[PDB]
Amino acid sequence: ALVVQKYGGSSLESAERIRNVAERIVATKKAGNDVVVVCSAMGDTTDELLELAAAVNPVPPAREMDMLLTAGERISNALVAMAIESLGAEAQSFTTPGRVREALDEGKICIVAGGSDTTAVALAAALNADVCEIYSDVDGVYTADPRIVPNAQKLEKLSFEEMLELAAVGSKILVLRSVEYARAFNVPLRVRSSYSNDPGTLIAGSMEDIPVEEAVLTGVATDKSEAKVTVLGISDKPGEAAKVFRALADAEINIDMVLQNVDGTTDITFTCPRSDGRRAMEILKKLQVQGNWTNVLYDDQVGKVSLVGAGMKSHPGVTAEFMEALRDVNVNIELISTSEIRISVLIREDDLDAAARALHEQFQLGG
Amino acid sequence: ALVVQKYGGSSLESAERIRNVAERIVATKKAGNDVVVVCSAMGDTTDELLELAAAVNPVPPAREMDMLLTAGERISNALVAMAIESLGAEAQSFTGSVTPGRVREALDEGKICIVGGSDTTAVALAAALNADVCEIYSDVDGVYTADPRIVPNAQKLEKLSFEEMLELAAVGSKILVLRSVEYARAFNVPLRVRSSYSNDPGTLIAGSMEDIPVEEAVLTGVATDKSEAKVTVLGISDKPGEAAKVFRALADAEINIDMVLQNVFSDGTTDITFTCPRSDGRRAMEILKKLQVQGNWTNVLYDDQVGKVSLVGAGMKSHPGVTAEFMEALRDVNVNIELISTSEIRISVLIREDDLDAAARALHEQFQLG
Amino acid sequence: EAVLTGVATDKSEAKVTVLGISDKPGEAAKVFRALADAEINIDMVLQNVFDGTTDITFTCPRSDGRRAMEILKKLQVNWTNVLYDDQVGKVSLVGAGMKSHPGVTAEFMEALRDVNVNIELISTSEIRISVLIREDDLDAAARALHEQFQ
Amino acid sequence: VLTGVATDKSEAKVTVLGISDKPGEAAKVFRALADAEINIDMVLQNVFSDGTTDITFTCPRSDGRRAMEILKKLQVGNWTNVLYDDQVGKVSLVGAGMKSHPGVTAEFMEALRDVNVNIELISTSEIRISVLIREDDLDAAARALHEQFQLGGEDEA
Ligand SMILES: N[C@@H](CCCC[NH3+])C(=O)O
Ligand SMILES: N[C@@H](CCCC[NH3+])C(=O)O
């Protein structure tokens, strides 16, 4: 077949891990596949390069930042290349599908600078690759975090949107962007470990094409990395919402989730990384003084726990089971977010582990 | 007023030092000069890259080594460019893949240009662009009359000729890479060895010692090498092609030949000695000892406790007394001269490595290089 | 970091809001058990934070709306009100990686400000920005997003 | 980096044979030349056996006869004999960075044997390979090196 592979920085930490990876590359070639590899920079290099750039120049020009991160990845490209060559195979380094295809036809393993994930999925899209393998330190996408849920087990199959949903609400396994391209075209992914014979988790179906039976509850995700900010007493007028998020956008505050429901005024709650929280509060407190909102609140002990599954789309039961599960372990639902295929609640971080267990137990994940 | 500046890895080992280099670059421009800059990789990045290469694929391809070491250099170039830009100057980066043409174009726009070895690239550029100086920055503020650890009252040289610098580099000094100084000599490109950690004007490597007036011609430095082994091949027949057998066989084994010496024939045979890195001494002896069989030579000696001490200076070219003083200095401390070799402006001698420090010390004071 | 692939509209749902649910473990459950047991398949669910009481709103097919009310009405004795809307419309911007590009969410809002359409409800994630508006504002709402984002 | 090839027929060569390999002995030779204002250039001392060695040096041709007379008036010191050659030629390959490229030195010696010129003395370094031959053999030696190293430039010297 034709298989594209992405290796993250962990997998490429040291010469030793670089050989482990080169052994996998060549094994894949030797089984009779065309093989194209996308490499990240070596363990933490990229964000070491982001630190340095920022110390050298607080607002680094994107034109010099492209050189910095490209160069850090090039050392990963060469080192993997030299390693594959040490094991007998031939390598061709690239820093479009039409010229890769030639090298492919010559039988060389093509190594292309990365984001890496999007580079890989794109390349798999353009070449009509049979699969795109993502190699990190995780051997799959589990039904829950096993460090938290003893009965968490490895999925073997998962739809495109199911994964996106998990990727959106906890799972840091793939960059969402790369998965959207995955689904945009019909590019199967699979999550595998650099140090295992295990097939890993196939992310392959569009959930619409899923046979009902296989449309089940998929998994439970956890996120304790976010703060909740709440703005009170916002007049219910066009452009008032634009007032808050234009302010936050200007100060580069990452927004994950915003919720608004309904004195002729409403409230807007949103979620941001904890390190953004403080500057989010500093910004919004200013605007409060000027004839706008009545108060703005801060909370950095929030936790998000979610259930995602194509099976909840057409099944009247799941919300009430979600609810009943948290009730029976005495955790209080503070906020409720949803999509067609996911339920997400905000609670205290200290209740997150207990909640993940309860949902996971209630819905028969883990057999 | 064009000035090429090469910054070593020590000059760029951290963000702080990079910013501090950018200011020096931007200050050099504000002083009315067009500036082109060449950067090594940060600190000990190249060595680290080389170690990682050698772990992954011994004898690795050159088109993967070129890609690996260019990337290390690219990190610095990007960071220095960002730094310069925070100081309000314009920078356009380059790869060798460019020329005088596209550089000189950017220079005329008043852009600071950051552009297959680093020392050689900088000197190459200065040459092509016809620069007033190529400055080599590092953590050493000049070239000295001797190794300061060994000779304690060794002084920074104000100025030095191309060949004097070339000659010192050939027998111990490791400040500039040799081929870059040779490039400077041929294209007549003045070099400045100076510190990026201070304001000291460093040392000028500028004229040809050909054009130093006999009266201004002086003694420049004392240099030391304790990394060589001495191999001697006895009973080589005095006939054309016999020398070639020795060196083809050493070259085919990639043995680095420094200094080779053969003195006049005086049986119908001569002898040949040569120095090599002590790492190579073992392979060199194996190759040579198994060709001793088959009658090519009567014996082959090995000696890895040999030190080399040299005196260089255009001064000795036209002046009869210097070999005499040199030999006399060593005799008066109690060191025996085992081997002698020369160039027009250099005396080199092999002695016991144990006698080496004291030999340099003796030479240094006898010629009052302090 | 991010990508934006399209916009969606929908006028098949109804909105029901249960006001004044006491913020206590199990109370959300009471509203959804009833609905679930009557086989009303629900979609959006929304609650903010808060008498120290709060409110939950959910959407369901309009075909099931009146009947969803009946089940909530006849079993209202622990909530203060339950409203029915049935003229609501949902507009979603679809994409992936919007968290690192907060400008997108700002622009979504500003796009509806400039066509003068009022946002009644909002629920976003890294992959989807959804708002409920008046069903009659849909075509404008949708149009405006296309111009903003292209 | 190979810059050029230089020739020279301006020098005499003189040798002291059987100098005792003992501190001070070289000094005696060169002091005497220095005192007689003889400006030397090359100097070579390599092998010992007798435990004695030889020292050869070069100086301008106009000083050769004086140089050998000074040394002969100091023989038996220790020495077997002093030699004087007024027909020595010197060819040099000039360049840089030759240690890490031992091919160059090998190609130097191959060039001269393929032209059947015998190499009488050798003295090299990282930036120069020099031999002494019959001045007789200069043309052939030079030509041979120009062709071997793709140079044709004498600019080196
Ligand atoms: N169909 C599910 C909806 C779960 C909420 C997510 N849309 C139910 O009736 O409970
Ligand atoms: N001509 C000087 C230098 C010695 C030879 C070095 N090439 C002298 O007579 O001592």
Ligand SMILES: C[C@@H](O)[C@H](N)C(=O)O
């Ligand atoms: C001894 C060696 O130099 C010999 N004369 C040759 O030319 O090969």
Ligand SMILES: C[C@@H](O)[C@H](N)C(=O)O
């Ligand atoms: C020069 C050499 O022949 C002697 N051993 C000396 O040191 O004088």
Ligand SMILES: C[C@@H](O)[C@H](N)C(=O)O
């Ligand atoms: C969600 C709300 O109804 C309440 N906090 C509960 O847990 O049921």
Ligand SMILES: C[C@@H](O)[C@H](N)C(=O)O
């Ligand atoms: C945000 C919302 O409360 C407001 N009505 C708006 O449309 O901007």
